[PDB]
Paper text:
Here we present rotamer inverted fragment finder–diffusion (Riff-Diff), a hybrid machine learning and atomistic modelling strategy for scaffolding catalytic arrays in de novo proteins.
The crystal structures agree with the design models, having backbone Cα RMSD values between 0.68 Å and 1.2 Å. The catalytic residues of [name] and RAD17 adopted the correct conformation with heavy-atom sidechain RMSD values of 0.42 Å and 1.09 Å to the design model and 0.89 Å and 1.2 Å to the catalytic geometry, respectively. Despite the near-atomic precision with which the tetrad was reproduced, [name] and RAD17 were more than 105-fold slower than RA95.5-8F. RMSD is a popular metric for measuring how closely a designed active site aligns with the intended catalytic array, but it is agnostic to the geometric constraints of catalytic interactions.
Numbering used by the authors: 1 to 200
The structure:
């Protein structure tokens, strides 16, 4: 059912092109900030450390995970940083564990999107559907506290949200796309602003 869900994501991009183009440009800006802050191994280690020390906010982690995964060679580094974040989050607490868990999840999610898309416009369409999956995944974690805050538990909630997202009605995916455009604009504006100050 992924085909029909992509069709509803494309309608949202056609019905709000100015917002979707802003998100796509905010995504390339995150890629530039991370690419230009130094080598991909330098930035990833730096991004992991700042996240482990509670200095990267949730929006700056979203932006860094995108920027580190928008390069094929970066995908290997982003995957390495994902496992390091999970092994560091397991030996951490509070914000350290929480921030590194998001970092681990978002790195692998962005590598997945980047691998499953052939250009930036295919990425924007697929990311719209994953945004609905995340909301469905979040409610699953909110309804069930026992659900593992662990990376392996969030991904299972995401897969369950992704399966339910492919089969959602047209208007549900459509409205989720307009919200993605709205939220991604704010998140990436603050996230890139914060990555800029910390990485240079
Ligand atoms: Na870099």
């Amino acid at each position: 059912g992924m085909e029909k869900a992509l069709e509803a994501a494309r309608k949202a991009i056609e019905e709000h092109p100015e917002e979707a183009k802003e998100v796509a440009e905010l995504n390339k800006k995150a890629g530039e900030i991370v690419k230009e802050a130094g080598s991909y191994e330098e930035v990833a280690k730096k991004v992991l450390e700042l996240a482990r020390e509670g200095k990267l906010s949730d929006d700056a982690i979203i932006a860094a995970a995108k920027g580190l995964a928008y390069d094929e060679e970066g995908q290997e580094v982003a995957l390495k940083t994902a496992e390091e974040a999970r092994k560091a989050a397991e030996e951490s607490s509070g914000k350290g564990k929480e921030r590194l868990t998001l970092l681990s999840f978002l790195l692998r999610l962005q590598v997945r999107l980047t691998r499953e898309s052939e250009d930036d416009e295919g990425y924007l369409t697929l990311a719209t559907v994953y945004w609905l999956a995340a909301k469905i995944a979040k409610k699953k974690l909110e309804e069930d506290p026992s659900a593992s805050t662990d990376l392996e538990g969030i991904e299972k909630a995401f897969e369950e949200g992704l399966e339910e997202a492919k089969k959602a009605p047209e208007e549900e995916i459509l409205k989720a796309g307009f919200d993605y455009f709205e939220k991604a604009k704010e998140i990436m504006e603050k996230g890139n602003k914060e990555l800029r100050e910390l990485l240079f």
